Amino acid sequence: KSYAALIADWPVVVLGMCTMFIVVCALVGVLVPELPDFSDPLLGFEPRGTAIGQRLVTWNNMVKNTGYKATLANVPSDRYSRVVFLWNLPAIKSMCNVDNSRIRSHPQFGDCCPSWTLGNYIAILNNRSSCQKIVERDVSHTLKLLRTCAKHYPRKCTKYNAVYQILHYLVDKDFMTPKTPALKYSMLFSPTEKGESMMNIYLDNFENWNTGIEFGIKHSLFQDYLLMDTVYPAIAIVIVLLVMCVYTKSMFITLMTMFAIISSLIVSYFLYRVVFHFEFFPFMNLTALIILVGIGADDAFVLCDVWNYTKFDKPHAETSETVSITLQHAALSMFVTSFTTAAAFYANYVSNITAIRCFGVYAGTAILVNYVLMVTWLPAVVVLHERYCQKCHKVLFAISEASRIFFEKVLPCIVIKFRYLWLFWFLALTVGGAYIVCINPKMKLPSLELSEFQVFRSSHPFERYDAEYKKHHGEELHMPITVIWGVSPEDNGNPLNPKSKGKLTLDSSFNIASPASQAWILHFCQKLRNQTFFYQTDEQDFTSCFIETFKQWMENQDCPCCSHWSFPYKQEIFELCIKRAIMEYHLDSKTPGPRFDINDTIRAVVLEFQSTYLFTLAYEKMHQFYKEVDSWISSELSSAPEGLSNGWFVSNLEFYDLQDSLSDGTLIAMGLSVAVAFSVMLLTTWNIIISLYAIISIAGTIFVTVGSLVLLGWELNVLESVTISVAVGLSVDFAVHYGVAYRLAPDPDREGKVIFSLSRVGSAMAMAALTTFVAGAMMMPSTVLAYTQLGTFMMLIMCISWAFATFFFQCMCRCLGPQGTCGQIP
Ligand SMILES: CC(C)CCC[C@@H](C)[C@H]1CC[C@H]2[C@@H]3CC=C4C[C@@H](OC(=O)CCC(=O)O)CC[C@]4(C)[C@H]3CC[C@]12C
Ligand SMILES: CC(C)CCC[C@@H](C)[C@H]1CC[C@H]2[C@@H]3CC=C4C[C@@H](OC(=O)CCC(=O)O)CC[C@]4(C)[C@H]3CC[C@]12C
Ligand SMILES: CC(C)CCC[C@@H](C)[C@H]1CC[C@H]2[C@@H]3CC=C4C[C@@H](OC(=O)CCC(=O)O)CC[C@]4(C)[C@H]3CC[C@]12C
Ligand SMILES: CC(C)CCC[C@@H](C)[C@H]1CC[C@H]2[C@@H]3CC=C4C[C@@H](OC(=O)CCC(=O)O)CC[C@]4(C)[C@H]3CC[C@]12C
Ligand SMILES: CC(C)CCC[C@@H](C)[C@H]1CC[C@H]2[C@@H]3CC=C4C[C@@H](OC(=O)CCC(=O)O)CC[C@]4(C)[C@H]3CC[C@]12C
Ligand SMILES: CC(=O)N[C@@H]1[C@@H](O)[C@H](O)[C@@H](CO)O[C@H]1O
């Protein structure tokens, strides 16, 4: 009644009140929001509300505070630039041919200084300024000085001033051969220092295919490159509209479904920012468009043919009955498909990183509201179509009709002449792929990152430099493990907003009792010093536990305070004299006393220590390191008294928790995606053999995805989480619509049922598969890795999933398939 009546009664009014909602949403969507910034590409990737993040951001909060006077009132520069994008020495003309280039339009003189560092450097012999090709002296000096000494480092004086180190600091280090190709690309520039001005010269004097660069414009050039990034999807959306127009035989419908998708995205953005107060907006929210123009148009293809399939079968009776029947059937199928997809992102939200959460919410609301709009624009497409050179058009129409029937008769014949074969070949592929690509070496975590990921394609300069400079700055440091007791580590800030961290909170219950708890810290420090894994070969620190300096200062000064006798009784004023003793600087943290707008005595007892292991940018060892130290500190704080009960562990390991949060977040997202997948598959089709069939198909297709995906050197960094979520969403998206379509077959046979059911499902889905495939494939040519990544991903997923779901379900339904309602429960 309600739907169909409202549809048939006033279509222009529902059109009006809808478009009203869209235009007002757009207006407010421009008025209120305070300019979503794209300055930092990876803005706010610090995982929040996850111990380490909390404990880190507390000690990080400690850094930005300390707002007082004293608390005792009483050359080849690393920052310069370089090209370096492969080291040979036939630089007879090349070196200064690189020099006389676009590095002089804006001088910006620093440290005109002759800034070659290879060319003028090699020419240290004579001439003083210019690039000079003195062949015999060049070769003889180069070959000699290259073969003099490399590895064994004021006992040997053959060089000029400071030569050797500087020589071996520009050119590639892999020259330890003791022995003697052309690309016109090497390591030279060492120009004026990097920053923003370097952007200005780059943008103005590059992007003409002119020796690739590194001078830290990645984070700004990315933001500017969003123009030609924005360009490509415009071609993607018009072409998907065009091919949709080719199929459904009505230009109006297809324009309206397209405008519906874009309206659905902007109404999602309004509903996102206005109600779900999230001031942050990362870049992946843009890639939402690309994922939404593939699956957003899908539902439409399941509608038009349904409307067409009834108006032929049912006899021109009246509009209301036809729209009612088509709507109830198409709506079940459209809700299940869209919700199953949306649920992935909505579940993915349970992850505890900032950007993925934000992206998930936005795309989630986008896919869900898209369904509402699709159902509410059904009336429009159908009823407007009711009240609606040409020779070539009619030939095309004949071709289109003929080809659809050609398809309709062939595909069932081919999929049934499969004859138990496609089952074997594809099952063997999946189990084989999966069982190898989920045990042995196949993937890793984003180790070579340091919060500097691949934000562009490998063909472009800035990424490729990673591989180039792999030929340096990395020093084997020890983990400054620092338990502090100074402040209650509680995150009093909005978890979603990355720009507001919070403020420190003092612990009034924490009071170093002057007569007590000193012997505790001593026995604790002794207990540590006796425990292993404590690197203590160096002895010239003098600030290790803070008690030693105390023991020295109570030992001295007695031979102002002027009251020191035996061990600590009154205290306070002696601690203050010891503060003076320390102050007589290296004052930042590094020492335990009161800071951060404090006029009174001790409130922070910031203790320092050294480590066992080295700073790697990978998992494994760091986790075992963390676990062991946390488990030890958790014991020693269990031995602690009432006066000091609160302490925790922290060091410089932001990267470790990023990896841990990503790994957990993906797992729990995957877990809920498979859970809702099974649940909703049960909701649509009431038999269970079909439900197992489904989940096996889901398992197979996903194991194709993250096996084929990774083999393309694609470890799980940041996006790969939400991709895996898409993969589960779109796998079941196909499976479901196959399912009910089988269940509702007129005959009680196992082959005629297949043929009919198959020919149906194929005709909806293959077109919708093609729709997505083109929408994804067209995005492959671009610069930013984000778009390339998601575009080529979802392309592969659809390309697999459709034909996967197709041939599995039907080859499985051929022989092993269900009979007279075997397994259905009321
Ligand atoms: C999903 C597809 C359709 C791409 C998304 C389209 C737009 C929502 C984005 C893409 C490019 C973005 C623009 C990229 C560059 C800038 C310049 C920016 O200016 C500054 O950075 C401040 C001054 C300066 O540094 O130059 C103001 C926002 C703006 C217009 C951005 C606003 C939002 C835009 C238009
Ligand atoms: C349309 C009909 C005839 C079915 C055929 C499907 C193909 C068109 C699909 C199946 C596998 C897909 C390929 C799977 C893997 C890749 C590798 C990938 O190559 C890269 O490594 C580029 C990424 C990078 O190095 O930056 C680019 C897309 C491509 C060729 C895909 C493009 C589309 C392909 C060829
Ligand atoms: C949809 C599915 C297929 C996605 C799976 C992708 C990742 C979430 C997987 C692939 C690699 C897995 C990691 C491979 C290796 C390990 C080491 C493992 O270490 C131990 O076994 C501890 C004991 C020891 O060996 O010392 C802990 C889990 C972890 C991080 C795994 C966690 C889950 C990861 C990140
Ligand atoms: C529906 C089925 C029957 C046809 C469509 C399946 C394809 C979408 C899949 C099947 C196997 C996949 C391929 C498996 C292996 C590779 C090789 C891989 O590249 C390499 O391993 C480089 C070679 C080397 O390592 O020496 C790139 C992805 C690719 C082409 C995969 C891309 C997608 C493919 C072609
Ligand atoms: C077109 C391809 C892509 C298939 C995609 C699925 C839907 C379009 C199919 C699945 C089940 C089909 C329905 C199966 C049964 C019927 C009952 C039929 O009404 C009758 O009961 C008439 C029986 C008779 O007198 O023969 C009207 C069409 C309808 C809704 C079918 C319309 C098309 C549906 C919804
Ligand atoms: C607290 C404690 O047990 N300290 C002992 C110390 O008495 C002993 O002199 C030393 C010999 O190496 O070993 C330490 O661990």
Author numbering: 179 to 252, 295 to 305, 313 to 338, 348 to 389, 415 to 441, 447 to 476, 485 to 662, 688 to 770, ...
Copy text from the publication:
The HH ligand is secreted into the extracellular space by a cell surface protein named Dispatched-1 (DISP1). DISP1 is a well-studied isoform that contains 1,524 amino acid residues, including a ∼170-residue N-terminal intracellular domain (NTD), 12 transmembrane helices (TMs), two extracellular domains (ECDs), and a ∼300-residue C-terminal intracellular domain (CTD). As a member of the resistance–nodulation–division (RND) transporters, DISP1 shares a similar topology with PTCH1, NPC1, and bacterial efflux transporters such as AcrB. TMs 2-6 of DISP1 form the sterol-sensing domain (SSD), which is widely conserved among polytopic membrane proteins involved in cholesterol metabolism and transport (e.g., PTCH1 and NPC1).
The construct referred to as DISP1* with an N-terminal truncation (Δ1-171) and a C-terminal truncation (Δ1249-1524) yielded high expression in HEK cells with ideal behavior in a detergent solution. The structure of DISP1* was determined at 4.5-Å resolution; because of the higher local resolution, the TMs are well modeled and most aromatic residues could be assigned. Because the DISP1* protein appears as two bands on an SDS–PAGE and the loop region 253–292 is invisible in the cryo-EM map, we speculated that the recombinant DISP1* was cleaved by Furin, which is consistent with a previous study showing that Furin-mediated cleavage is required for DISP1 maturation and localization. The ECDs of PTCH1 and NPC1 twist together to create an intermolecular tunnel for cholesterol transport; in contrast, ECD-I of DISP1* is shifted from ECD-II by more than 15 Å, which is not observed in either NPC1 or PTCH1, leading to an open conformation of the two ECDs in DISP1*. On the other hand, the loop between residues 253–292, which is absent in both PTCH1 and NPC1, is disordered in the map, indicating that the flexibility of this large loop permits it to be accessible to Furin and the cleavage by Furin may release this internal loop to facilitate the endosomal trafficking of DISP1. An internal C2 symmetry is found in the TMs of DISP1*. Similar to the sterol-like molecules found in the TMs of PTCH1, five sterol-like molecules are observed in the TMs of DISP1. We tentatively assign these molecules as cholesteryl hemisuccinate (CHS) based on the density shapes and the hydrophobic environment that is created by potential binding residues. One is found in the sterol-binding pocket of the SSD (site 1), and two are found near the N terminus of TM12 (site 2). There are two novel sterol-binding sites in DISP1*: One is located in the pocket created by TMs 7-10 (site 3) in a position that is symmetrically related to the sterol in the SSD.
